[PDB]
Design a protein around this ligand. Structure first.
Ligand SMILES: Nc1ncnc2c1ncn2[C@@H]1O[C@H](COP(=O)(O)O)[C@@H](O)[C@H]1O
Ligand SMILES: Nc1ncnc2c1ncn2[C@@H]1O[C@H](COP(=O)(O)O)[C@@H](O)[C@H]1O
Ligand SMILES: [Mg+2]
Ligand SMILES: [Mg+2]
Ligand SMILES: [Mg+2]
Ligand SMILES: [Mg+2]
Lengths: 590, 592
């Protein structure tokens, strides 16, 4: 693949830039989580300083403080000083010099640095991409936006590690390189593998729509060639990294015994979405997304897919589809989900016998399909990940910025359209149904027309939603998602997932962009809040129980999670135990 | 290369055979280590049984017991029984069924299972290779022997893991595939890298012999193009797997600040030896071997290479070579080491500060060069890995067998020449110099003329030697090899690494081959031992104190070490405390 081209993106110039960007983000987000407390340096108003563990090295910087204990740290401003000499900005030396101040044990530190190095390299890659503007992105379309994204999750410092990719694999498989990928297809023996269909899915028809009859006959022929009966098998699509580095070695027994048969590559070409392991069908965008098991470490979790949980997945999706059709409060917000319509799972009996339930060895071979948001589009409508709204091009324009311009409306009017599609349905789900999501940039998609947010689309459902009412009534396979979550924390699904981690940045980007000041931003949030509350007094009891207008709420720290344990940020059985709450934040709705 | 082809070697017929062969080695070796005690079954003379943790699954097999508690399990005899029903033989099921009998923690068990799945695939691959007789391998030559070996270390059941290679990488880099590999060359800034030169070596001339002036100047070209002065840099060959999967990500910082520069591939074609990480120059067999840092898991160790230790490596080889030259007792044996002549290491400052002395992060980027044993050959001579002596072809003939035949010597006559070349220096080293090796079939090379062993060649020197005398008198570059060892255990480099881990197998093989009786084999070892001791009465005190003839010696278990910790079987600051001695073995040298 050419040894030297592979590492061409790693030049001194781009590494210096990438390092400055990442340190500025480590200052902003670690001050926000109070891991350090910058002190006003010398006698300057906006100048602050942060010192190393020993206090001999000083990171001086200027910054602009904003709502929700935000720190707009100016990348250009940062310096590193020790014994009266400048030193170079180095993200690694940074985490090492602050290792006791941050939560970094001798056991976690070296791997964290791998994740830092890995993220920095991806910034070096993105810096070699042709610069595109906010206008250029929207002109490109849905996938130009997906791959155009550069930040990632805006809270996590080490957010694009992808530990397990070699540099060639990085270039092949990272979403931000937009290189086509062809899926590897397996035949899996039904003594180990299970196809779980959603409402109205037939297997023999599903795979023929999703591969074409000609490919289906060919796969069945590969089986017949080996003396095997296609009726004993089902199909599983696997990520090529999984098949070459993991399945073909760890599952060698299954392949050799013909519990698994390697069939070939897919004729359609897929592109990795921001979540890496999920694939949009580029050849045929009408067709399904494909989510895949990928035993690689990104942002606090390994990204294997539990075959156990695949059994429950299409049912949970079916039920929230039925829920949203049958509730005209939500139908009024155009809110929909792209249902995880089908799944497959391989149960490896030997590794089950050898592991516990929460073992990565059980999440190595599983896949789900997901509806496409495309054929649902009416004339004039477009797609975009909502993580675009906090993307700032090389000119200082946000996609939000360009969308507000292009719509022509007053900023607060455009915004009102956005939260009526995106934010309001969350409110109604919590209050009227006890239903929370994980609705950040990656998990949300917005329909656009004429520059204005027509409706929202949600995804990553079964894995992520919680129903916070152990006693509430549900169908059987849905009852998994219930949980006893502390009362004081029940509202963090809005406070931290929506305000501290998205609006905090959106409001603050539009403020520096001089498009909408923070006060006018948050006032609009309150006004669509009351607009929903007053329209439904039959829940005023819960309205007061869970007061979204309280003068303070808990500061839940996200990085602090990953510094504590960056292979499993939270136990999945008790997700509430691992949270780290360090003080409070002035609610901007006061 | 093709998807369906890369796993073509995994067929049901070969998987079954692989599992049978690996279960029989499990029975034999775990029996030897007294992890379980098979009891005679159904009154039939050779029949034995071993039961699972819960008692329900029974493995029944016939076996010939031999010296040193050896168990010759017949693989065709093994049957799996549960509820009075025959089950298929499956190494993975086996190790689960006995997870508590063996020392297999919930944490280690799945990783071991991978190492097992991986050893089984390698066997499956090797079963696709064209069958080749002992005679065929001999006629093929030095690398036909290396790439033709199949067992690997005979003691360790999980010996051929190569945990890190994906299937395509296995096909490219595994010794048994013999596919040619081009090393990746990198420029390292002298601020972090250091070239350590053995006696009579000079960096400038050494790189031009090994790469060619035309290529060295091409590399300086690349450096100057980027603005870099070649005097500020030195060269490091890296295993391609380590470049693509480790250094380019884990060391991205260094590549992009230009502390490392990726120069490119080598013009010569290299062949992986049995260490996986050491390469023989196939284009130019005169040129040095290259040992690379390979951050992959195999038989109980990360096969990384410690940069700090390259600084002493050639000094230690230099010292040993002088020691052998200036001692006629060793010189009369023909013994040579192939010296590790030069080494480079890279000190990653940041990762050092984030880790401790013994850490895989400090072992990701280094290389040593090793002398090729080839030019030293005189007319009629040929090389083989000592590992070939216990290799058995598809006809039941061992390369030992074929050599003995071709030689036309009485077996004991043949065995005596091998022993004088191989076993005698180990005695003299221990008794005159308190010195020990790791002299198994991979760390040892035999020179052959007319089917007979002329001389032995040792290798893997600096990492492995030890001078069991903390007060001993060495040059300062070499003192790091001294060590306090218990009074007993000192002899275990012979007792365990030679007798129990190699001779046990070579004896039993020639016995089942009706070439040489067991009792004859050990009588010959005793004679060679006495041929030495009688020749040196000035050392009788040490002969009694370290009695090679005592009626028993300790049964140092090896598979137990790997079952307890398969990442690091022995700490390198205290390698004796890991040893698991479980009772004793009747010493075959006692009555003789
Ligand atoms: N802008 C973004 N917001 C949130 N997650 C992102 C973003 N870009 C990439 N991701 C990745 O998408 C995945 C989200 O997983 P989950 O937390 O289950 O949605 C993680 O691997 C994230 O690092
Ligand atoms: N026949 C063999 N005897 C011993 N080691 C072997 C053999 N074949 C391959 N090896 C590998 O070579 C290495 C030997 O380790 P060392 O003790 O440093 O020589 C390990 O990776 C072994 O698994
Ligand atoms: Mg998600
Ligand atoms: Mg998820
Ligand atoms: Mg060796
Ligand atoms: Mg060694």
């Amino acid at each position: 693949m050419s040894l030297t081209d592979a590492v061409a993106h790693l030049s001194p110039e781009r590494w210096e830039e990438a390092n400055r960007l990442l340190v500025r983000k480590a200052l902003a987000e670690f001050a926000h989580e109070r891991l350090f407390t910058p002190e006003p340096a010398d006698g300057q108003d906006g100048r602050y300083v942060v010192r190393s563990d020993d206090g001999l090295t000083s990171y001086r910087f200027t910054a602009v403080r904003r709502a929700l204990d935000h720190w707009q740290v100016d990348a250009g401003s940062i310096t590193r000083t020790r014994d009266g000499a400048e030193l170079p900005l180095a993200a690694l030396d940074f985490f090492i010099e602050l290792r006791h101040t941050l939560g970094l044990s001798d056991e976690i530190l070296p791997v964290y640095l791998e994740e830092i190095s890995s993220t920095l390299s991806g910034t070096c890659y993105k810096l070699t991409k042709p610069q595109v503007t906010a206008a250029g992105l929207l002109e490109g379309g849905f996938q130009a936006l997906e791959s155009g994204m550069t930040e990632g999750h805006p809270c996590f410092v080490a957010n694009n590690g992808r530990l397990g990719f070699g540099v060639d694999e990085y270039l092949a498989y990272a979403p931000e390189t937009a290189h086509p990928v062809r899926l590897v297809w397996l035949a899996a023996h039904r003594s180990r593998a299970a196809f779980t269909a959603g409402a109205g899915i037939d297997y023999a028809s599903f795979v023929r729509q999703e591969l074409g009859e000609e490919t289906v006959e060919r796969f069945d022929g590969v089986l017949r060639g080996r003396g095997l009966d296609p009726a004993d098998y089902l199909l599983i699509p696997v990520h090529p990294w999984q098949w070459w580095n993991k399945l073909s070695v760890t599952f060698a027994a299954e392949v050799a015994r013909q519990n698994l048969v390697c069939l070939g590559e897919s004729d359609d070409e897929y592109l990795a979405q921001q979540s890496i392991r999920t694939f949009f069908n580029a050849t045929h965008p009408e067709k399904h997304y494909v989510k895949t098991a990928l035993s690689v470490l990104n942002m606090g979790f390994m990204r294997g897919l539990s075959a156990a949980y695949m059994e429950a997945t299409p049912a949970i999706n079916d039920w929230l589809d039925r829920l949203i059709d049958n509730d005209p409060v939500l139908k009024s917000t155009g809110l929909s989900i792209i249902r995880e319509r089908a799944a497959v799972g391989y149960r490896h009996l030997e590794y089950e016998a050898a592991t516990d339930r929460y073992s990565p060895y059980r999440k190595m071979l599983a896949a789900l399909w997901r509806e496409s948001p495309v054929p649902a589009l009416r004339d004039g409508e477009s797609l975009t990940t909502m993580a675009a709204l906090v993307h700032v091009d090389h000119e200082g324009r946000s996609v939000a910025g360009e969308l507000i311009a292009r719509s022509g409306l007053a900023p607060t009017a455009w915004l009102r359209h956005y939260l009526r599609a995106y934010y309001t349905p969350l409110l109604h789900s919590f209050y009227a149904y006890d239903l929370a999501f994980m609705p950040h940039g990656e998990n949300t998609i917005l329909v656009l027309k004429d520059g204005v947010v027509q409706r929202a689309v949600y995804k990553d459902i079964a894995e992520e939603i919680v129903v916070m009412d152990p006693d509430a009534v549900l169908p059987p396979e849905v009852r998994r998602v219930r949980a006893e979550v502390p009362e004081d924390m029940k509202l963090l699904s809005i406070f931290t997932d929506v305000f501290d981690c998205f609006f905090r940045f959106l409001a603050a980007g539009l403020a520096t962009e001089e498009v909408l000041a923070e006060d006018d931003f948050w006032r609009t949030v309150a006004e669509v809040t009351r607009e929903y509350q007053e329209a439904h007094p039959e829940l005023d009891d819960r309205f007061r129980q869970y007061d979204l207008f309280a003068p303070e709420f808990a500061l839940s720290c996200l990085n602090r999670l990953q510094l504590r344990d960056n292979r499993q940020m939270v136990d999945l059985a008790d997700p509430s135990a691992a949270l780290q709450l360090v003080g409070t934040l002035r609610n901007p709705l006061a």
